[PDB]
């Protein structure tokens with residue numbers, strides 16, 4: 521495993537060193553999106569939670585194609601405001617329910633260290 525704790529204050533510095541292989545070693549779901557919501561990275565733990573095959577979702581739009589239940593002011597809305605502002609750091613509970621058994625999760629979104637990428641971290645609650 522990669523020892524990083526969900527919600528950690530410096531998580532963005534830590535995850536900057538990890539490759540797709542490394543990211544698959546996290547205790548939680550990790551997704552990296554560009555400013556337009558396209559999926560740059562998607563780790564194994566997210567695949568375990570949502571049932572999606574990580575390889576198949578990279579390159580797709582998260583809010584439009586892959587995860588339309590997140591297309592709402594309460595999820596996508598916070599994302600777009602953070603991208604516009606160039607600053608994002610929010611944590612909230614949410615229910616994933618698209619093509620899958622409803623699953624309650626904790627979501628943490630944070631701007632990355634590179635200029636126009638953004639993390640979505642997810643774990644069960």
Ligand SMILES: *C(=O)/C=C\c1ccc(O)cc1
Nearest residue numbers: 570587588589590617618
């Ligand atoms: C809402 O969109 C439900 C499902 C979902 C599937 C995959 C990922 O990564 C997040 C959310």
